[PDB]
Design a binder for this molecule. Structure first.
Ligand code: EIC
Ligand code: EIC
Ligand code: NAG
Ligand code: NAG
Ligand code: NAG
Ligand code: NAG
Ligand code: NAG
Ligand code: NAG
Ligand code: NAG
Ligand code: NAG
Ligand code: NAG
Ligand code: NAG
Ligand code: NAG
Lengths: 299, 278, 50, 49
């Protein structure tokens, strides 16, 4: 096969290096049992205004969204740093949840590298973003016959907004060169305006609830993990391991080295993961490839 | 409630060079016996560093001004009586915007983000009762409270307040405000030098990453003054304290990782031609 | 020394990502679906072949 | 026939109840996906079940 011919002459014929088949596989996830509070964040009765968005830390969770398939239907679900299909075989490190209310047609501005009033004066996403943006229509809950005026957005500012920034200052905006001195005069405007929501408005003006999740995937110890069952650790043989979403193939062994409290796994000169720390047991293990040594066929 | 303090001597400050300070871990990945080259915000070697101090006598002074905050600063405080308490960060510090406050009263460190109304001279008092004990009264850093979106208070503890001939702490900190996060790096190395900055090499480890999400341009420092019986001017004597401030710049370093997995040496790529060829 | 240095630098070349999101295949395969990850795999393959 | 906002799930490399328990497209797919509103024909006053 290597020579790509059916006739071989004399020679040494150094063929491909031999390999060992990893007949088994293991999965190792931390001890998390209680489900994540999806009801608290998604099914909240009230949602904060867009300019003063509310940030909530999430930890010690089992990120199983299968319970959401009967509750809510999402009109927009876009993930950037991670494939949506591979969202069940991963452990997340430092997830955060942000939520607010915007108009029907300004959901498109909740994305990196976008412009508009929302993306300039209210809420800006970083250029390098890893996470998902979820939005769903909420016309039934956030609208009233008399007009819902509880939500406000900013209309004027002296400059753009840096990523993941907030500004709740209500100082009078000056449009011209004449000083305003607090008085709402000709060139003086109130920086934040009000939203008008009616049940009979067009679909582009119905209120939309937005939830944005940002996380780091591999670096640092993880706390939010998906629904994968953990198996017993197997040592000193080739196995298709899965340590908090890092899938590879190698032989595990005891390690003399000890990690710092804020470190999870280490890398060698080749920048590959040679040592990892088990999540269930605070132990150090080393990973080595299963193939080592050359073979040649004399004939 | 806070009142500006009087009777302080006037003199321009001095300058000092931080030899090999300001090196911190770049990420949270273990490494060993490797020469990793990385670029990030760093404190250049042999950079100008202002030297403030708080001391009693006509040389009594405090020197807690509004230093500028340029894309991350390096802070290193050395003392023996826990005079240094914390800092305040913000743009204008006049209740028009939000500001971050970090301080431990005496028993628990408090972190808040709010529209605080500070005054010109923020400080905390300490009272030395002679019959028996330092009470640490007079918590008058700010003047009003507001929405206070962020909030965090640690578990109660206790600490000594007198600790009085040479400095013994040399507590270093590094602050960075990038993409809405407030990263803090800290290190604690005991020393015995008398009245200067001890040259050496120290690697700083990450402490906390607060999603504050505000805009920071200026900052101050909170000092604790103790008065017992010495006569605005009620004998606010300070025992002994000094701190040094440096400004981070975008540089390239050649960090060295030890066998254990610790950073022990660094090389600047812009210090001088020899370091450049290194 | 020349031969040893050549082999050492050839080994060291594995730590550079040729425009990909990461320099290792395991992380790319764990984070991305096959059809999207194939682009980064091809980039790394071309770099290492060069 | 699917819900109005679930037409997005008819694509390769997508998740959701439709793309997990009802109808899944292969990763290497060649073809076109066509959808159009049918509220006039597939709805009744008493509810179409
Ligand atoms: C009359 C325009 C003449 C051509 C000007 C040329 C270039 C400027 C480009 C774009 C400005 C118009 C689009 C503004 C989009 C705002 C988006 C929003 O509000 O959500
Ligand atoms: C409250 C969540 C905290 C963070 C959990 C971390 C990771 C899990 C990721 C995503 C779960 C939410 C989106 C579910 C999409 C369902 C799509 C549908 O039904 O059509
Ligand atoms: C985690 O769970 C495993 C199996 O249930 C158990 O053996 C282990 O002791 C647990 N870890 C801790 C820290 O309790
Ligand atoms: C979840 O939301 C639905 C509609 O928004 C509501 O009917 C239901 O009571 C909510 N459940 C909880 C537990 O909040
Ligand atoms: C799913 O939602 C429907 C709403 O009509 C409800 O009748 C049913 O009981 C729900 N089932 C589950 C398992 O939640
Ligand atoms: C941060 O505050 C300063 C005030 O000194 C201001 O000039 C600057 O524009 C602010 N940042 C942004 C992004 O507006
Ligand atoms: C401190 O000084 C400022 C400005 O000089 C002044 O506005 C303030 O009133 C002073 N403090 C007190 C308590 O009067
Ligand atoms: C920097 O330090 C040197 C030496 O102390 C001094 O001469 C110089 O004025 C300083 N420069 C600044 C800008 O402080
Ligand atoms: C800075 O101070 C240190 C220690 O006093 C000294 O060794 C060094 O030469 C000084 N550098 C300059 C440029 O003065
Ligand atoms: C400091 O604040 C805490 C609450 O944050 C409070 O309990 C404590 O009493 C304060 N310190 C003093 C000396 O009162
Ligand atoms: C010390 O005595 C003073 C005055 O009697 C009293 O206020 C204070 O609480 C005492 N402190 C201790 C620690 O006994
Ligand atoms: C903050 O409180 C003021 C009242 O003092 C209120 O008018 C304003 O809307 C509040 N803003 C936020 C973001 O909570
Ligand atoms: C660093 O490595 C040496 C080598 O044996 C060891 O003796 C020392 O204990 C290690 N450092 C620490 C803090 O353990």
């Amino acid at each position: 096969c290597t020579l790509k011919s059916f006739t071989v002459e004399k020679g040494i014929y150094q063929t491909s290096n031999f390999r060992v088949q990893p007949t088994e596989s293991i999965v190792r996830f931390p001890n998390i049992t209680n489900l994540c509070p999806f009801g608290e964040v998604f099914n909240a009765t009230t949602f904060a205004s867009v300019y003063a968005w509310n940030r909530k830390r999430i930890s010690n969770c089992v990120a199983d969204y299968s319970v959401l398939y009967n509750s809510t239907s999402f009109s927009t679900f876009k993930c950037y740093g991670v494939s949506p299909t591979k969202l069940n075989d991963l452990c997340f490190t430092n997830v955060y949840a942000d939520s607010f209310v915007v108009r029907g047609d300004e959901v498109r501005q909740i994305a990196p590298g976008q412009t508009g009033k929302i993306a300039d004066y209210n809420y800006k996403l970083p250029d390098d973003f890893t996470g998902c943006v979820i939005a769903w229509n909420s016309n039934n809950l956030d609208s009233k016959v008399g007009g819902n005026y509880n939500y406000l957005y900013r209309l004027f500012r002296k400059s753009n907004l840096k990523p993941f920034e907030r500004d709740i200052s209500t100082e009078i905006y000056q449009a011209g060169s004449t000083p305003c001195n607090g008085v709402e005069g000709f060139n003086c405007y109130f920086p934040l305006q009000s939203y008008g929501f009616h049940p009979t408005n067009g679909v582009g003006y119905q209120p939309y609830r937005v939830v944005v999740l940002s996380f780091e995937l591999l670096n640092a110890p993880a706390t939010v993990c998906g629904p994968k069952k953990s198996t017993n650790l197997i040592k000193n043989k080739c196995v298709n391991f899965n340590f908090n979403g890092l899938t590879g193939t190698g032989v595990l062994t005891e390690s003399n080295k000890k990690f710092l409290p804020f470190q999870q796994f280490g890398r060698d000169i080749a920048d590959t993961t040679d040592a990892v720390r088990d999540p269930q047991t605070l132990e150090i293990l080393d990973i080595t490839p299963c193939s080592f040594g050359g073979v040649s066929v004399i004939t | 409630q806070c009142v500006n303090l009087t009777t302080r001597t006037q003199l321009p400050p001095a300058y000092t060079n931080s030899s090999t300070r300001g090196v911190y871990y770049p990420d949270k990945v273990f490494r060993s016996s490797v020469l990793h080259l990385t670029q990030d915000l760093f404190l250049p070697f042999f950079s100008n560093v202002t030297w403030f101090h708080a001391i009693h006598v006509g040389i009594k002074r405090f020197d807690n001004p509004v230093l500028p905050f340029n894309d991350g600063v390096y802070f290193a405080s050395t003392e023996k009586s826990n005079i240094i308490r914390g800092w305040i960060f913000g743009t204008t510090l006049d209740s028009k915007t939000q500001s971050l406050l970090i301080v431990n009263n005496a028993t628990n460190v408090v972190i808040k983000v709010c529209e605080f109304q500070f005054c010109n001279d923020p400080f905390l008092g300490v009272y030395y009762h002679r019959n028996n004990s330092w009470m640490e009264s007079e918590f008058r850093v700010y003047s009003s409270a507001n929405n206070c979106t962020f909030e965090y208070v640690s578990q109660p503890f206790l600490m000594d307040l007198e600790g009085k001939g040479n400095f013994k702490n040399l507590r270093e900190f590094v602050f960075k405000n990038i993409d809405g996060y407030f990263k803090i790096y800290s290190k604690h190395t005991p020393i015995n030098l008398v009245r200067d900055l001890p040259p050496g090499f120290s690697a700083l480890e990450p402490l906390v990453d607060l999603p504050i999400g505000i805009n920071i341009t200026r900052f101050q420092t909170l000092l604790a003054l103790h008065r017992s019986y010495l006569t605005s001017s009620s004998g606010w004597t300070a025992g002994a304290a000094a701190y040094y401030v440096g400004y981070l710049q975008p540089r390239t370093f050649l960090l060295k990782y030890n066998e254990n997995g610790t950073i022990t040496d660094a090389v600047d790529c812009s210090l001088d031609p020899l370091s450049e060829t290194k | 020394n020349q031969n040893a240095q050549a082999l050492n630098t050839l080994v060291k070349q594995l730590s550079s990502n040729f425009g990909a999101i990461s320099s290792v295949l395991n992380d790319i395969l764990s984070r991305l679906d096959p059809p999207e990850a194939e682009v980064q795999i091809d980039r790394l393959i071309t770099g290492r072949l060069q």
